[PDB]
Design a binder for this molecule. Structure first.
Ligand SMILES: OC[C@H]1O[C@@H](O)[C@H](O)[C@H](O[C@@H]2O[C@H]3CO[C@@H]([C@@H]2O)[C@@H]3O[C@@H]2O[C@H](CO)[C@H](O)[C@H](O[C@@H]3O[C@H]4CO[C@@H]([C@@H]3O)[C@@H]4O[C@@H]3O[C@H](CO)[C@H](O)[C@H](O[C@@H]4O[C@H]5CO[C@@H]([C@@H]4O)[C@@H]5O)[C@H]3O)[C@H]2O)[C@H]1O
Ligand SMILES: [Ca+2]
Ligand SMILES: [Ca+2]
Ligand SMILES: [Cl-]
Ligand SMILES: [Cl-]
Ligand SMILES: [Cl-]
Length: 138
């Protein structure tokens, strides 16, 4: 029943958000120290992923995330019946925008099948967090 899926944050299928950050897209990509990551993530911004799950299970969520402010949080959601269901919300420690640290995101039950996952800038701050990748582990 062991399974592990690392999803690169830069490999979103869509991004969105209202915050005016002056960029071409509401969430941007950059590289630092060979880590490609999403940045310019603001409050209300989100990044959508499609994930194929062979093995049903209660997966643990781990983010490689960083922030340079207090008040960023990653809300992990799954689309269930054309309706986003909030799964976990995780504050991101303020240890520097480029300083990615493993961050425990709680757990989410994923059936065998294909899931739409949303990572949403859920905290109070105008600026939220940067994200290298996240890993789902059973
Ligand atoms: O006599 C007294 C006055 O003298 C006069 O000469 C002056 O006019 C002055 O008047 C004041 O001037 C300042 C001080 O008070 C206000 C008054 O007008 C004014 O305040 C400034 O106003 C600015 C807008 O006009 C700004 O809001 C400024 O705030 C800052 O603006 C930028 C720079 O630093 C941040 C700060 O909010 C903001 O930058 C953003 O900060 C984010 C962290 O908060 C983050 O780093 C953003 O960047 C992102 O970081 C990582 C995530 O994604 C990417 C992205 O680059 C990256 O990986 C960043 O853009 C405010 O102080 C009298 O003194
Ligand atoms: Ca943004
Ligand atoms: Ca990455
Ligand atoms: Cl990926
Ligand atoms: Cl590194
Ligand atoms: Cl769950």
């Amino acid at each position: 029943s062991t399974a592990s899926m690392a999803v690169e944050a830069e490999n979103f299928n869509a991004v969105g958000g209202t915050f005016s950050d002056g960029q071409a897209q509401p969430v941007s990509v950059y590289t630092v120290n060979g880590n490609t990551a999403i940045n310019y993530v603001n409050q209300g911004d989100y990044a959508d992923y499609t994930i194929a799950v062979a093995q049903a299970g209660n997966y643990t969520i781990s983010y490689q995330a960083g922030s340079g402010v207090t008040g960023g949080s990653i809300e992990f959601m799954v689309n269930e019946n054309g309706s986003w269901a909030s799964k976990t919300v995780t504050a991101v420690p303020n240890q520097g925008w480029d300083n990615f640290q493993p961050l425990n995101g709680g757990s989410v039950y994923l059936s065998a099948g294909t899931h739409q996952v949303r990572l949403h800038g859920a905290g109070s701050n105008n600026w939220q967090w940067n994200l290298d990748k996240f890993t789902l582990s059973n």
